């Protein structure tokens, strides 16, 4: 709910970071979070796609002459079957779409939550999906944030002074 835009130009993944340090503006893409989202969407598609309907000889559905009860019953059965499967098709699509939207929004918050915990008391949230790091970050420091190997203690003393 804090990201209110979509970065067109992010062409190496679905999620990622961009920074503005003293060296200059940069851009990067996350890959653990991207493939997690794609795998789950891929798994959803496979389950829907499976072909398990194999019918060989069924009743006649088109009629040339006009008959009575038997012809009407056959038309009633096929109409009932079509309406039931048409309703199932709508609900299945509606349900799997709403799950795809939540899943994708959740994966962004999950990435945001883990980046927040990484900068333990060295950054503050700035409303939108960006942090303000209160110490001098070079390119290597930003890379360690994406890798997962950011040591919050070496920069802690100088960050706490700038914060307060």
């Amino acid at each position: 709910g804090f990201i209110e835009n979509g970065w067109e130009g992010m062409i190496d993944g679905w999620y990622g970071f961009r920074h503005q340090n003293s060296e200059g503006t940069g851009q990067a893409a996350d890959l653990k979070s991207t493939q997690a989202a794609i795998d789950q969407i891929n798994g959803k598609l496979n389950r829907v796609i499976e072909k398990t309907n194999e019918k060989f000889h069924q009743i006649e559905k088109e009629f040339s002459e006009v008959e009575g009860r038997i012809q009407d019953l056959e038309k009633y059965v096929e109409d009932t079957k079509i309406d039931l499967w048409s309703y199932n098709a709508e609900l299945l699509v509606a349900l799997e779409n709403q799950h795809t939207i939540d899943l994708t929004d959740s994966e962004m918050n999950k990435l945001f939550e883990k980046t927040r915990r990484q900068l333990r008391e060295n950054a503050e949230d700035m409303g939108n999906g960006c942090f303000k790091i209160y110490h001098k970050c070079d390119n290597a420091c930003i890379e360690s944030i994406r890798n997962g190997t950011y040591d919050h203690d070496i920069y802690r003393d100088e960050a706490l002074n700038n914060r307060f």
Partner: nanobody, 124 residues
Framework: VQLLESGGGLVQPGGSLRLSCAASGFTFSTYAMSWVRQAPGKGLEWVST????????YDAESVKGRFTISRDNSKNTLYLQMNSLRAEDTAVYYCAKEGGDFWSGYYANWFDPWGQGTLVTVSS
């Protein structure tokens, strides 16, 4: 689809070498590419991979600081640069293409076509 490798040869330890993989038969700027090496008689080891635009590069730990990867989407050629070569780098290097067509251009989950491979050797 056809991937052709080149550049393999004998290099002294600590030397450098540049391998080129020319790819034709598909849109080169859509699919991710990878380098995979197989030591003589041993198993397969992943080396590197690159995204469709070339902005994202991923390397293995035993290769990380030494070998780099690149693309020239205009020339449809994939390049791997060797900077510091050790005795354990003697292997047959293959260039592979991301075989998937689902959000292709990010990473190579599987490698559908493979090249015939170029053999690099280091020795005295």
């Amino acid at each position: 689809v056809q991937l052709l490798e080149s550049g393999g040869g004998l290099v002294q330890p600590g030397g450098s070498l540049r391998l080129s993989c020319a790819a034709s038969g598909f849109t080169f700027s859509t699919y991710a590419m990878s380098w995979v090496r197989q030591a003589p008689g041993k198993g397969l080891e992943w080396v590197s991979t690159i995204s469709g635009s070339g902005g994202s590069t991923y390397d293995a730990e035993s290769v990380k600081g030494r070998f780099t990867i690149s693309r020239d989407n205009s020339k449809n050629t994939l390049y791997l640069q060797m900077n510091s070569l050790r005795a354990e780098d003697t292997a047959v290097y293959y260039c592979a293409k991301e075989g998937g067509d689902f959000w292709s251009g990010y990473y190579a989950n599987w490698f559908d076509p493979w090249g015939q491979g170029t053999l690099v050797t280091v020795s005295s």
